[PDB]
Tab-separated table of C-alpha atoms and ligand atoms in Angstrom:
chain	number	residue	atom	x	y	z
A	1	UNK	CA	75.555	81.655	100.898
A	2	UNK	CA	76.695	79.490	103.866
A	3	UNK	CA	78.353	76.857	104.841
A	4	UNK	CA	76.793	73.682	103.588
A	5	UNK	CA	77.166	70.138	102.933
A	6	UNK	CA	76.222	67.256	99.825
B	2	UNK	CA	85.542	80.969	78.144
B	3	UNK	CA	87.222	78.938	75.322
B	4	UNK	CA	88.564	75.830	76.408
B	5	UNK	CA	92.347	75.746	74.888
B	6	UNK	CA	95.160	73.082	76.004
B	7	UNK	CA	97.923	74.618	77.867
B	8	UNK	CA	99.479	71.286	79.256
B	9	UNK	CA	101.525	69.765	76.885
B	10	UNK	CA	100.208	66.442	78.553
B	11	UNK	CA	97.996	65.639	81.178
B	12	UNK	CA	100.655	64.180	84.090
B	13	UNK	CA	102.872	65.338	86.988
B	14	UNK	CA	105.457	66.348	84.313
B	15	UNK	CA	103.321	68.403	82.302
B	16	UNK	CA	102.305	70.715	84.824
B	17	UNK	CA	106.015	70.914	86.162
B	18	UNK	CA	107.144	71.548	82.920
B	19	UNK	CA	103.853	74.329	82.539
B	20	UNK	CA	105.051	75.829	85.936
B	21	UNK	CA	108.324	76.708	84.777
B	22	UNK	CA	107.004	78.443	81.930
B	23	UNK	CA	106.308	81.929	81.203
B	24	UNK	CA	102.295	81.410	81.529
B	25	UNK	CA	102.596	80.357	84.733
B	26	UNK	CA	102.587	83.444	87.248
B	27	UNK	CA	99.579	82.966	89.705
B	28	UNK	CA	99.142	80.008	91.680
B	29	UNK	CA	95.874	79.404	93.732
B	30	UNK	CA	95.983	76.653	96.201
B	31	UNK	CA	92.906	75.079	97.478
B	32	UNK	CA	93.426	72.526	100.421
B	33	UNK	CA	91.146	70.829	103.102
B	34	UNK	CA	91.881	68.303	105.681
B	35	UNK	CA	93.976	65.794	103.922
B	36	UNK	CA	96.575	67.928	103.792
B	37	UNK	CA	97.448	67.933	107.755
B	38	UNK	CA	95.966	64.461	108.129
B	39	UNK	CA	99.706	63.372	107.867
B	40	UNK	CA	100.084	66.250	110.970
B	41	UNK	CA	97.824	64.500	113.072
B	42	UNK	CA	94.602	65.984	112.924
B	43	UNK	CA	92.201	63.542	111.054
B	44	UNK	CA	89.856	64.214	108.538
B	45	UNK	CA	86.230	63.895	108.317
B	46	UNK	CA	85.670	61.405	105.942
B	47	UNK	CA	88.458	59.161	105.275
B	48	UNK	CA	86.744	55.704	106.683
B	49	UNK	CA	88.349	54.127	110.148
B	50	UNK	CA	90.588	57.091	110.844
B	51	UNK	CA	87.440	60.269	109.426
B	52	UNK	CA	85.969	61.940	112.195
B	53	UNK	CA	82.803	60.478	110.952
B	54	UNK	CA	83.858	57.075	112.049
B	55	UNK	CA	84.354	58.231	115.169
B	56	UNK	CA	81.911	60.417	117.145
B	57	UNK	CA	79.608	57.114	118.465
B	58	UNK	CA	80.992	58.400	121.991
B	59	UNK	CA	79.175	61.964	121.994
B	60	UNK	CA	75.223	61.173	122.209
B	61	UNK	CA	74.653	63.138	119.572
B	62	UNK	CA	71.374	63.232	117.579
B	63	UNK	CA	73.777	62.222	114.247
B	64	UNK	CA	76.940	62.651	113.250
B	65	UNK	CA	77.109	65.710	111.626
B	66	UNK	CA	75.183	67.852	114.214
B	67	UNK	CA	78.479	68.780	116.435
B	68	UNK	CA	79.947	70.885	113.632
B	69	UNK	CA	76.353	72.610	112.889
B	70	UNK	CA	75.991	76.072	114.438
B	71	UNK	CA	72.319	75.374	115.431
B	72	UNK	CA	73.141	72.436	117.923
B	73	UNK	CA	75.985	74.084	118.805
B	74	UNK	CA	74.213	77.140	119.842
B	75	UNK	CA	71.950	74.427	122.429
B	76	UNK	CA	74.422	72.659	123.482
B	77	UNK	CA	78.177	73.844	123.144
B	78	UNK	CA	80.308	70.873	125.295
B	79	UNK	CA	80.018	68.115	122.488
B	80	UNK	CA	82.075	70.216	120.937
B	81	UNK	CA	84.135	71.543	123.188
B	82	UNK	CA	84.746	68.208	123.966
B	83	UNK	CA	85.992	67.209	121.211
B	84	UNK	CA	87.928	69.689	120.793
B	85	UNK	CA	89.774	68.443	124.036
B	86	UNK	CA	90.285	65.191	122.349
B	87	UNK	CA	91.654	66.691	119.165
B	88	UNK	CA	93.526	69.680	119.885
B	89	UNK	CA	97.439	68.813	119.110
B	90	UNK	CA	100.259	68.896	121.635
B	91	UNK	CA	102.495	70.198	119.056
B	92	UNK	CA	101.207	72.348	115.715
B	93	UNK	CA	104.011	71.019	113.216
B	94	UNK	CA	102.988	71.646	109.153
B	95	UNK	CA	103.823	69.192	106.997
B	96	UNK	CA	105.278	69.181	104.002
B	97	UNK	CA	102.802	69.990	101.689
B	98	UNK	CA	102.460	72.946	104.156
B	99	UNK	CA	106.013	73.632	103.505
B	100	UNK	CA	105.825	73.319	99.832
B	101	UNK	CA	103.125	76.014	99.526
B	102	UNK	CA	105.482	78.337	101.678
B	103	UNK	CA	107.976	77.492	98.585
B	104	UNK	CA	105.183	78.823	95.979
B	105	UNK	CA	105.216	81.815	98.340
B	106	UNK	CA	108.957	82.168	98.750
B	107	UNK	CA	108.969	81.870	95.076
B	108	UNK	CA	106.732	84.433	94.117
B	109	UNK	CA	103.997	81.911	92.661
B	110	UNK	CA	101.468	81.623	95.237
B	111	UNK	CA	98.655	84.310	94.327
B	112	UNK	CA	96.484	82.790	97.107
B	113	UNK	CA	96.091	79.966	99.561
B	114	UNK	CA	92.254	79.008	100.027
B	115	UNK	CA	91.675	76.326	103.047
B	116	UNK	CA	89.177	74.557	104.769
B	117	UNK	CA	91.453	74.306	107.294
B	118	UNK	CA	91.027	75.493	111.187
B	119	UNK	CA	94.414	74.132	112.169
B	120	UNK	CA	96.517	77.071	111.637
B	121	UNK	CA	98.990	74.992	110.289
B	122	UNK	CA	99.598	77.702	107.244
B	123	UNK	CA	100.256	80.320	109.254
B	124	UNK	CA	102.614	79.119	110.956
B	125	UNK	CA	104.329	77.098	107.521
B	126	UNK	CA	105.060	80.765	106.944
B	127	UNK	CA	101.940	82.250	105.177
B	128	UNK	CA	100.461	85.716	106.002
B	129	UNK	CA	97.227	86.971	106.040
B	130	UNK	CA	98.127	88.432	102.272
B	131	UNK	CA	98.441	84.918	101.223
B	132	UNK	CA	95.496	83.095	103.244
B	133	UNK	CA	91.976	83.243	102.759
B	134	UNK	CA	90.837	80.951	105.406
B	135	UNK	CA	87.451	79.867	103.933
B	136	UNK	CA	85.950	78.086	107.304
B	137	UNK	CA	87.960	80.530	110.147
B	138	UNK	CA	90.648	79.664	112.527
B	139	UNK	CA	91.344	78.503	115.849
B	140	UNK	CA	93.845	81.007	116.140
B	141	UNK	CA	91.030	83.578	117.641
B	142	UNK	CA	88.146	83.408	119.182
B	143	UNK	CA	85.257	85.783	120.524
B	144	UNK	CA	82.443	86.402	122.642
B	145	UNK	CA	79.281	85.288	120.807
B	146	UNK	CA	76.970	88.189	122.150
B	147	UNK	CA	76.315	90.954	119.661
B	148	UNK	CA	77.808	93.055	122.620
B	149	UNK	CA	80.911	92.102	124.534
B	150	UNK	CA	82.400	90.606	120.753
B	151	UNK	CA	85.871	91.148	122.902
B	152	UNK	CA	88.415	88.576	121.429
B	153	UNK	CA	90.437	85.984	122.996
B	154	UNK	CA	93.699	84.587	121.727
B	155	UNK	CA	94.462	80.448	121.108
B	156	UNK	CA	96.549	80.375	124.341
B	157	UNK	CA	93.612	81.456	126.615
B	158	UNK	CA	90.828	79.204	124.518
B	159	UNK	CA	93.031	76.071	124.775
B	160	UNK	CA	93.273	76.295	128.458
B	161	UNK	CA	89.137	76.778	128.628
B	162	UNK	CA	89.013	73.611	126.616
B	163	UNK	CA	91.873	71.280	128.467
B	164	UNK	CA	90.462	72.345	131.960
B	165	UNK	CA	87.065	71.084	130.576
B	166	UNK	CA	85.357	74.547	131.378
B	167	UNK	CA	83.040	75.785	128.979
B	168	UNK	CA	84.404	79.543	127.524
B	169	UNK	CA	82.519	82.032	129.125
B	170	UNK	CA	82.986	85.857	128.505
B	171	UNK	CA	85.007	87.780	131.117
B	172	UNK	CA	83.087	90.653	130.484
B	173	UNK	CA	80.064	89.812	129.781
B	174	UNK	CA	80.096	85.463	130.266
B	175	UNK	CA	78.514	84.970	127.207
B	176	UNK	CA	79.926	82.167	125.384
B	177	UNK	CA	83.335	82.618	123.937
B	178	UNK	CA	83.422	80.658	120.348
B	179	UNK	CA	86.465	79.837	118.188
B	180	UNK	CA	86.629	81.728	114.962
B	181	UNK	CA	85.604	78.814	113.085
B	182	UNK	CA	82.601	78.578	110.279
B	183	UNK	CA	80.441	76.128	111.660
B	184	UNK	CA	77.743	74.733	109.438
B	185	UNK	CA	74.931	76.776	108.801
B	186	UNK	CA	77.241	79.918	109.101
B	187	UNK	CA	78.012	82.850	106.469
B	188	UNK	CA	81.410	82.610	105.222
B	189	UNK	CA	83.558	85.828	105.869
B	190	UNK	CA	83.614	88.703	103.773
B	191	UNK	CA	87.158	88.443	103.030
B	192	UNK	CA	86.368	84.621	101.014
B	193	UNK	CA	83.811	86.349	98.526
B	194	UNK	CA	86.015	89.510	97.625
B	195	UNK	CA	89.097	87.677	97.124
B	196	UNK	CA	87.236	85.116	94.712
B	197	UNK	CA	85.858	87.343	92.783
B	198	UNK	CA	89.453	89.232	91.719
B	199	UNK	CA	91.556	85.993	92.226
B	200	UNK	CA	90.435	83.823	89.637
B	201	UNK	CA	90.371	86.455	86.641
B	202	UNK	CA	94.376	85.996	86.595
B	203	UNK	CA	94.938	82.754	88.170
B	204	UNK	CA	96.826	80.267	85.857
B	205	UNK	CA	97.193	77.086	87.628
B	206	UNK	CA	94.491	75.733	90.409
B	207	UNK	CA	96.386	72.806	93.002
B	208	UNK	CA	93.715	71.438	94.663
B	209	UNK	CA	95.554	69.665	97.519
B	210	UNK	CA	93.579	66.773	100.348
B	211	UNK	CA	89.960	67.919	99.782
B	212	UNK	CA	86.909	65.842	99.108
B	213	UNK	CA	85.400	68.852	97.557
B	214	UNK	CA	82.142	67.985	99.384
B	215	UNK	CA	81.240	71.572	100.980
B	216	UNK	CA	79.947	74.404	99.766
B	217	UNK	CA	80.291	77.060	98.258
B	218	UNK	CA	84.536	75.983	98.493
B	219	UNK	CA	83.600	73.428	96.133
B	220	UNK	CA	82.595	75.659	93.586
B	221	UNK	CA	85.811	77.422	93.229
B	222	UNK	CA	87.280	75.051	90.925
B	223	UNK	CA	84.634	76.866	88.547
B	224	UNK	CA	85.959	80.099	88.900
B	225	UNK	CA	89.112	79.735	86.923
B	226	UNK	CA	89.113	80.483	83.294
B	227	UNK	CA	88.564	77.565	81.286
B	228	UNK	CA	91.856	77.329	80.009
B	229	UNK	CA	93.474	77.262	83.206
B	230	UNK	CA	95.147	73.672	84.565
B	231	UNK	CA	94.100	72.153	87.463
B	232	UNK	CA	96.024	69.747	89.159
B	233	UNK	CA	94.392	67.942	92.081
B	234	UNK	CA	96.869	65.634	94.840
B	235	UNK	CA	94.838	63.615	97.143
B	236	UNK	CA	94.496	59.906	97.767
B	237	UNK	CA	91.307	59.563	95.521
B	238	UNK	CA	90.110	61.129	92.674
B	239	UNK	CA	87.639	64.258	93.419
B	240	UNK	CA	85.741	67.149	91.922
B	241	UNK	CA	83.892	65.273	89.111
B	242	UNK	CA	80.564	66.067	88.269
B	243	UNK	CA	77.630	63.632	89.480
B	244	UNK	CA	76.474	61.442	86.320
B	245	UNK	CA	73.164	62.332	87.703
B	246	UNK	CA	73.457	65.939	88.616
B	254	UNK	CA	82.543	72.745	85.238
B	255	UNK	CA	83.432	70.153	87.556
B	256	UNK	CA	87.176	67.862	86.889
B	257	UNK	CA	87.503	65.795	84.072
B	258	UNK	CA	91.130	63.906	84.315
B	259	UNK	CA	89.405	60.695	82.126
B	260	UNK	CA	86.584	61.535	79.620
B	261	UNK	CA	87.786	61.939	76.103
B	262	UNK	CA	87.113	65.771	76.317
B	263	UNK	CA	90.032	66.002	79.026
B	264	UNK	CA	92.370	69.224	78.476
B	265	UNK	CA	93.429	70.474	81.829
B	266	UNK	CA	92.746	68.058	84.496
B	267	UNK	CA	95.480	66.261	86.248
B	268	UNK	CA	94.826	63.947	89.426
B	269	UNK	CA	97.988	62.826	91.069
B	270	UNK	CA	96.788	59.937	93.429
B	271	UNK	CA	98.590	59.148	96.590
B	272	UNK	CA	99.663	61.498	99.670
B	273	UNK	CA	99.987	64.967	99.824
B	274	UNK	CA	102.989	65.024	101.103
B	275	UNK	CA	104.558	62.641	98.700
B	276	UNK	CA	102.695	64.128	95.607
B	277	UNK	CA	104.583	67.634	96.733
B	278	UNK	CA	107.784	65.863	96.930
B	279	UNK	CA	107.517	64.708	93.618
B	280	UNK	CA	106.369	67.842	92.126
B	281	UNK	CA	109.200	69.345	93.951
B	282	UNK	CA	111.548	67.418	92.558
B	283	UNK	CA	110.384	67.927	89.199
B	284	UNK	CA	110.637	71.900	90.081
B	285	UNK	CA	114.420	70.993	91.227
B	286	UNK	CA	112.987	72.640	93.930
B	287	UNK	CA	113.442	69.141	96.379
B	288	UNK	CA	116.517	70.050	98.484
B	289	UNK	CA	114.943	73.405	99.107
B	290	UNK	CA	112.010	71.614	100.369
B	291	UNK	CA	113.788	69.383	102.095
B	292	UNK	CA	116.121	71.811	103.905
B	293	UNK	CA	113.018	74.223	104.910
B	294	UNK	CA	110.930	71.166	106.134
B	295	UNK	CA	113.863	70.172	107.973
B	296	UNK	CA	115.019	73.419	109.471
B	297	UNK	CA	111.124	74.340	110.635
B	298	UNK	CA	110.589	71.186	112.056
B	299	UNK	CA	114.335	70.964	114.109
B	300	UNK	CA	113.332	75.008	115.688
B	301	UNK	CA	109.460	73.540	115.991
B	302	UNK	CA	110.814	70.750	117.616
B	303	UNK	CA	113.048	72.551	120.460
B	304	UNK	CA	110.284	74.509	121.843
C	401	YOY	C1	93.208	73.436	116.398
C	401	YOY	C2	93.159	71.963	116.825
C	401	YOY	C3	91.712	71.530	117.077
C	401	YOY	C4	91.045	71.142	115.735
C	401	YOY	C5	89.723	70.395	116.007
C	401	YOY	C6	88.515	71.180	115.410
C	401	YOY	C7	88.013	70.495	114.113
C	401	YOY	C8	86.556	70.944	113.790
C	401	YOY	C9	86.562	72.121	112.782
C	401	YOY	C10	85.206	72.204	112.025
C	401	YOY	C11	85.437	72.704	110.571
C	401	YOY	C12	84.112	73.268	109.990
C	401	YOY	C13	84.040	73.234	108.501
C	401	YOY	O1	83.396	71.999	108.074
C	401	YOY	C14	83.960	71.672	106.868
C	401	YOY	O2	84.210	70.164	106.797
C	401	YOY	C15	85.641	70.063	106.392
C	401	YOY	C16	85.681	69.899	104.891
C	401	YOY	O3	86.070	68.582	104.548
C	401	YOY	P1	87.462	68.357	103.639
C	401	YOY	O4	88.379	69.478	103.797
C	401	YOY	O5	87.200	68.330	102.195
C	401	YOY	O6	88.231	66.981	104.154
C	401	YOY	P2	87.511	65.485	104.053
C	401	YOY	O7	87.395	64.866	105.367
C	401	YOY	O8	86.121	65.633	103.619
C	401	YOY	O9	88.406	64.548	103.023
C	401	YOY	C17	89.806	64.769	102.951
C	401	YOY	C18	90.242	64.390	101.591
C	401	YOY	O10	91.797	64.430	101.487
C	401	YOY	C19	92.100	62.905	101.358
C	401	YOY	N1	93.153	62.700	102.246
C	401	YOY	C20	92.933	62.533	103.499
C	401	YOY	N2	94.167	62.415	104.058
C	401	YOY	C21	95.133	62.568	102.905
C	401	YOY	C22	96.498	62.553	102.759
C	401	YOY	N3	97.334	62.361	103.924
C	401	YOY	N4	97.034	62.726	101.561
C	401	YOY	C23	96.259	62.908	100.477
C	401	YOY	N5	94.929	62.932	100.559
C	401	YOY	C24	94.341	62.768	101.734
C	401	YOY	C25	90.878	62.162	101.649
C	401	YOY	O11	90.821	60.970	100.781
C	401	YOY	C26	89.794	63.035	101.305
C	401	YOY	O12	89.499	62.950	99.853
C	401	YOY	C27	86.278	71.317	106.790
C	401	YOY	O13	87.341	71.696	105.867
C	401	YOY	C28	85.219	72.357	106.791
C	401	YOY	O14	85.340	73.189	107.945
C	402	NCA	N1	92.509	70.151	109.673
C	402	NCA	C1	91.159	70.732	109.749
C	402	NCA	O1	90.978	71.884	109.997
C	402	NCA	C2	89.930	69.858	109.528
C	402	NCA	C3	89.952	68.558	109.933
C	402	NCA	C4	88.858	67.779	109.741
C	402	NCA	C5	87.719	68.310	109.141
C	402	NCA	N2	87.703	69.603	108.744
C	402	NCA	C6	88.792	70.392	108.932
C-alpha cells in the first residue's frame, strides 16, 4: 500500500 | 501469539534490566521526526514549532498538499521551496542518533526503520544493512521520467535548491526529484521484505519521536510477536488504539509489555544509557562525532 495519512 | 510477560516491570529499569539479558538479541528501532527535532529539523506536528504550524506562507490549497505527490507533480517549487528554507547548514545526529549507533556497535540493533529523510543515520554510523529507510532519503535523487532515471547525488540537488532553480534533468530536463516517499507514493521494496523476516525474531521494539500517524509505518508495532516489549521515548504518549476504532497499551489493566518513557529523545537515551552503563560510551562517541563534524 502507500504512503498515507489518519 | 500468546501474550506472556517478559518485563519484570513495566519502567525504564525493566527493559534495561531485559536488555542485558539473554532474551534480548534483536533490537528493531522505529523513529520519525522527533528524533532530529533536537538537530534542527522540525517536525510536522508538534504545535508552534510542527511544520503544520507553519506553511501559511506557501499559497497552498491546505496544508498537507506540499508533501502529496499529486500536487507535487503540478506544481514542484512549493516544495522546493521549502526545502530551501529547511535544508540544514550542518547535518549533526543527535544523540539518540548516536545511541542507536551503540545498539549497532553492540551487536543489538537487528534493524533501524525511519521516517526520516534527513540522513542523519547514515551518517551516526549506520549502513544500508542496518537502515530501512521507510519514506526515502535526501541523500539521492533522480530524474522523474520513466527514461533518463539517471541519479544525482545530495551535493548537486542542494545547489538546485539554494540557487532557487527548479532540478531539471541534464539529459533529458525532466524533473529531477529527491528520493523521498511523498504521499500518495508506494513504499520501496526493500520496507516490505525486510518486515516480513524482521519481526519473526525481533525481541525488543524502541519506538523513538514518532506520532505513529502514517501508514503502513504505523502498523509495524503489530508485527512483533506478542510477547515482545515495546518501549516507546517521545514527549507524549503514542500508538494506542482509537476508543472508537494490537496497538500500545502502557495503562489499561491488561498491560504486559508496553513502556512509554515521556520526555526527549535525547534525554530518554541518556537515561537508558546509563542504565546500560553504557553512558560514558555514549558520551565519548557523541562527543568525538560532533568535535570531527564540527571542524569541517
Ligand atoms: C535534508 C534536509 C531537508 C529536509 C526537508 C524535507 C522534509 C520533507 C520530507 C517529507 C517526508 C514525507 C513523509 O511524510 C511522513 O510524515 C512524517 C511522519 O511524521 P512523524 O515521523 O511521526 O513525526 P511527527 O511530526 O508526526 O511527530 C513527532 C513526534 O515525536 C515527538 N517529538 C517531537 N520532537 C521530540 C523530541 N525532541 N523528543 C521526543 N519526542 C519528540 C512529537 O511529540 C511527536 O509525537 C515523515 O516521517 C513521513 O515522511
Ligand atoms: N526529519 C525528517 O525527515 C522529517 C521531518 C518532519 C516531518 N517528516 C520527516
Amino acid at each position: 500500500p502507500r504512503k498515507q495519512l489518519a | 501469539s500468546q501474550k506472556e510477560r517478559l518485563l519484570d516491570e513495566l519502567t525504564l529499569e525493566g527493559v534495561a534490566r531485559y536488555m542485558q539479558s539473554e532474551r534480548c538479541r534483536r533490537v528493531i528501532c522505529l523513529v520519525g521526526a522527533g528524533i532530529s527535532t533536537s538537530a534542527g529539523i522540525p517536525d510536522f506536528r508538534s504545535p508552534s514549532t510542527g511544520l503544520y504550524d507553519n506553511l501559511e506562507k506557501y499559497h497552498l490549497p491546505y496544508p498537507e498538499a506540499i508533501f502529496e505527490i499529486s500536487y507535487f507533480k503540478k506544481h514542484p517549487e512549493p516544495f522546493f521551496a521549502l526545502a530551501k528554507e529547511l535544508y540544514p547548514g550542518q547535518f549533526k545526529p543527535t544523540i539518540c542518533h548516536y545511541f542507536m549507533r551503540l545498539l549497532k556497535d553492540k551487536g543489538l540493533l537487528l534493524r533501524c526503520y525511519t521516517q526520516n529523510i534527513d540522513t542523519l543515520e547514515r551518517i551516526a554510523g549506520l549502513e544500508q544493512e542496518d537502515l530501512v529507510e521507510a519514506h526515502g532519503t535526501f541523500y539521492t535523487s533522480h530524474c522523474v521520467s520513466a527514461s533518463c532515471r539517471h541519479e544525482y547525488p545530495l551535493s548537486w540537488m542542494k545547489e538546485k535548491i539554494f540557487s532557487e532553480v527548479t532540478p531539471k534533468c541534464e539529459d533529458c530536463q525532466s524533473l529531477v526529484k529527491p528520493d523521498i516517499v511523498f504521499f500518495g507514493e508506494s513504499l520501496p521494496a526493500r520496507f516490505f521484505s525486510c518486515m516480513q523476516s524482521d519481526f519473526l525474531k525481533v525481541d525488543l521494539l524502541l519506538v523513538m519521536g514518532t506520532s505513529l500517524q502514517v501508514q503502513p509505518f504505523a502498523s509495524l508495532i503489530s508485527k512483533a510477536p506478542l510477547s515482545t516489549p515495546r518501549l516507546l521515548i517521545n514527549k507524549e504518549k503514542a500508538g494506542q488504539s482509537d476508543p472508537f476504532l494490537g496497538g500500545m497499551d502502557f495503562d489499561s489493566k491488561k498491560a504486559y509489555r508496553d513502556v512509554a518513557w515521556l520526555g526527549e529523545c535525547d534525554q530518554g537515551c541518556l537515561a537508558l544509557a546509563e542504565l546500560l552503563g553504557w553512558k560514558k560510551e555514549l558520551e565519548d562517541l557523541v562527543r568525538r562525532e560532533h568535535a570531527s563534524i564540527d571542524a569541517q
